[PDB]
RNA sequence: AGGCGGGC
DNA sequence: GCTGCCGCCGCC
């Protein structure tokens with residue numbers, strides 16, 4: 040009877056978890072929880088859906104096999120979901136985090152299904168008539184044309200028109216496809232959007248799951264009589280001078296600078312100024328290379344071809360509390376707010392496009408860019424040092440470059 | 446208006462019954478009124494949020510007693526706002542973002558000529574609200590100086606979440622970058638709304654922009670707001686030289702010079718690509734000059750306060766009246782004339 | 785760029 | 793009172 044119930048509850052490889060299930064409790068909850076935490080970790084890192092799918096695919100095979108005919112793997116998926124409802128129902132923040140991660144897990148799994156299995160799951164969204172399609176044909180084609188070009192690689196207009204003739208449209212309230220409306224990817228008429236089915240199913244899933252978590256919380260005090268409380272508490276907590284004002288502009292000295300300092304000097308020469316973070320990054324670097332306080336004031340006054348003198352002396356520990364501020368290392372530089380238009384602070388290995396970096400660097404370039412793509416900016420910078428002659432401080436890059444000539 | 450003029454206005458003239466019946470959505474007082482936020486702005490610069498009113502009589506008596514220079518309408522809450530110590534979808538359109546394209550008025554002046562910018566903005570927004578969103582129950586209200594407020598009162602519009610309000614705004618707010626020193630470079634092909642809006646605005650471009658406002662007769666202004674709409678540097682440099690050699694050509698002449706110089710510059714098998722691109726730049730400029738330039742903040746959140754219809758404008762004395770197709774700012778009654 | 789104080 | 797903006801004063 041239990042097997043027949045699970046055969047009926049899982050006619051599809053996907054479920055809305057509508058009916059309650061009729062060491063395993065802890066392991067199955069932990070294994071689902073690890074997948075949900077990896078999803079949330081990838082979402083917080085702004086990874087694309089395809090990168091997230093690639094990372095989670097091996098974790099599914101290990102921790103929570105999807106698409107198996109095994110009754111035990113199907114049981115593990117159900118019971119882990121319902122066990123996590125008991126864990127995450129307790130606070131609004133825990134419910135919102137669980138609904139978000141679980142709805143994203145649903146999206147990934149739906150995309151990993153075959154088109155046949157997706158259709159069966161939907162059966163277990165009204166198409167428009169051919170007349171309504173003919174009436175709206177021009178407006179529907181104008182809206183969808185760009186999507187056919189960029190998503191289906193249909194570069195020729197004849198091929199786009201032929202595809203559009205066969206293509207069906209779904210009529211729904213526009214409130215169900217707000218994300219597609221914001222991007223103008225759907226046609227709008229009289230409060231209806233002409234399409235996105237996965238977003239509708241995901242919103243219904245999220246709404247239903249949130250309602251069921253509230254119901255679960257209302258019944259939870261009856262369960263406080265049971266073995267389970269320590270595990271539920273623990274799982275819920277598991278979620279928780281040679282160098283002078285003139286020489287610093289010369290090739291002899293500047294050939295020793297890392298890319299961030301070259302970028303700051305170029306911005307200063309071009310704009311006759313640097314904004315706050317850039318002034319601090321460059322001022323402290325120049326202090327670190329041995330530019331005296333008096334020469335630094337000459338440098339800045341000359342470069343800016345009441346408001347500034349004090350700040351430059353303060354960087355040298357000559358004012359206020361007299362703290363001799365240490366020059367910034369790469370970690371510190373990277374921690375500052377990201378540079379925008381008109382800013383020159385930061386790290387070019389992170390902040391510049393591969394196109395700009397490649398032009399500056401022109402097999403060696405590919406090696407540097409591979410490090411950049413991985414977020415290993417100091418490794419990319421170390422590679423540039425070695426190829427042009429681990430460093431993680433602009434002043435160490437300069438000092439090492441000078442040591443090679445001494 | 447003096448403080449006594451405002452007392453007289455609220456005593457004898459302000460349509461409290463009609464505003465109450467509008468905001469209450471029923472003939473009988475309901476939670477749509479009892480739980481609605483009002484903010485009162487006073488002549489002292491004081492600003493009092495979280496007022497709420499139980500009846501037409503309570504609403505009238507509290508506004509008469511308070512004598513505010515204006516009040517602002519907020520959301521319907523789950524509890525009465527006045528007990529705090531224990532919304533219509535709205536659009537705002539002002540003239541400020543059209544100041545770079547008008548010559549008939551300067552600074553905070555308005556006339557029937559530049560009011561055509563607001564009239565076209567209302568026409569294009571109304572087309573989207575009716576045809577794309579299916580809204581039926583909306584009204585435009587004069588802001589009392591040089592703008593207009595839309596109030597969409599459809600039940601579906603009232604119940605929109607801040608995410609849905611943002612999506613409605615992002616659909617209607619085509620001109621996100623208001624800077625006139627740069628080409629818009631709008632996405633091609635145009636979305637159906639934007640294509641329809643262009644065809645609705647095109648018939649007005651010659652009569653409003655090239656003839657009545659004529660903003661590009663001034664060669665410095667043409668260099669600042671007409672030339673940056675073009676895509677090609679050689680065309681821009683050639684037009685700039687040609688207008689330096691031939692000063693004070695009208696906006697209509699300068700508009701034709703663009704096509705004549707482009708036809709002289711772009712020859713051979715690539716000419717059709719340049720012709721298409723120039724047409725696209727001229728179309729983007731029709732939209733830059735005449736398309737609705739909404740205030741984006743007031744629309745985004747359900748909690749945003751907006752000035753009530755029939756408020757007095759404190760600097761002009763104009764009543765913030767409902768707008769019809771015939772409306773111009775000179776038709777708005779002043780409180781002193783009504784007295 | 786951030787924080788604190790004063791004035792309009 | 794708070795909020796927000798503008799100016800000044802150092803600090804960090």
Ligand code: SF4
Pocket residue numbers: 297298299300368369372373385386387388416417420431432433436
């Ligand atoms: S890795 Fe460090 S030294 Fe190198 S360019 Fe980036 S911030 Fe500068």
